[PDB]
């Protein structure tokens, strides 16, 4: 499904929809199995494959995936910690993004070969941008 995406509006919409549907079906049929962790011969996962291939729409969908179905909600990557009035506080997963893995999404995007279509724009997805700004503000600015 990741390989088929080509960043067009309809293609992206359907690829995301089918990805979500297959994920839900796999969760219902085999709750124990973790589908998104499986890797191909190159060792990439669907998330890493999308990040490296420059599939911006699929990456944006995956990083902000939010499933409200009670039976299958652990699949979500974005959660609402609390809400009082018009104010919401949300959480992002950062499972394989914070450079503490073999090849995180952030490292894969940063160290692209410039052959990837739109690596310039893949850092505008909310969690990546805010994470980079936080890392810059916390400790690295003084080192620079």
């Amino acid at each position: 499904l990741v390989e088929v995406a080509d960043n067009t509006v309809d293609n992206t919409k359907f690829v995301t929809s089918m990805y979500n549907e297959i994920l839900i079906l796999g969760a219902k049929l085999h709750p124990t199995l973790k589908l998104e962790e499986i890797t191909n011969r190159k060792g990439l996962t669907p998330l890493a494959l999308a990040a490296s291939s420059g599939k911006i729409g699929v990456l944006a969908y995956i990083l902000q995936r939010e499933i409200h179905e009670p039976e299958c909600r652990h699949l979500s990557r974005k959660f609402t910690e609390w809400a009082y009035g018009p104010v919401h506080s949300s959480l992002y997963d950062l499972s394989c993004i914070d450079t503490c893995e073999k090849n995180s999404v952030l490292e894969v995007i940063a160290y692209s070969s410039s052959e990837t279509p739109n690596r310039h724009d893949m850092l505008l997805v909310e969690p990546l941008n805010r994470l980079l700004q936080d890392k810059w503000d916390r400790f690295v600015k003084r080192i620079f």
Partner: protein
């Protein structure tokens, strides 16, 4: 025990309260006792019931109100509020308004709920460093800022207790300032 009643109200199950009411009546204890609210926070069973709603309805609240009135406790029970420095002063009327529940606020006010309680906790003050939501500090200001026209109309024209329209909060802001 406080834990049992808290679980019963949170689970929306009022079966256990059938013994709690006679238990409290015979035990000679009052819900206002320190042994029925969190030590550091101060939350009461009524507040937990208000927080834990389902589809906007929680029948257990009616049972708690009935038992409280049966023991003559509504005066100090409905007007209970957080004692924590972070939600200081935050009452049940604020929860009722914030959840957009007209019936709950009507029941609370007609049962003696004060309408001039100030939710002057740190979560409610205007602080740029930390998260929060500033709406003034009074129920009328909360209703106006949270977009409940019917609720503000009701508070101003409440028969049991009308809400003062010129009241000012800690920083002096009125409803218009808020």
């Amino acid at each position: 025990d406080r834990r049992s009643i808290f679980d019963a109200v949170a689970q929306s199950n009022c079966q256990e309260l059938e013994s709690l009411l006679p238990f409290l009546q015979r035990s000679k204890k009052r819900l206002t006792d320190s042994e029925f609210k969190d030590p550091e926070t101060g939350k009461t069973c009524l507040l937990k019931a208000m927080l834990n709603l389902h589809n906007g309805q929680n029948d257990t609240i009616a049972l708690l109100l009935d038992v409280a009135r049966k023991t003559d406790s509504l005066k100090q029970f409905v007007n209970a509020s957080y004692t924590d420095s972070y939600y200081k002063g935050q009452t049940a009327l604020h929860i009722a308004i914030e959840r957009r529940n007209m019936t709950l606020v009507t029941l609370l006010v007609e049962n003696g709920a004060d309408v001039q309680a100030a939710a002057n906790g740190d979560f409610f003050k205007k602080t740029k460093g930390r998260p929060g939501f500033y709406f003034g500090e009074l129920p009328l200001s909360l209703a106006a800022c949270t977009n409940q026209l019917a609720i503000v109309k009701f508070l101003l024209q409440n028969s049991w207790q009308p809400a003062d329209i010129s009241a000012r909060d800690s920083v002096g802001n009125t409803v218009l300032h808020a």
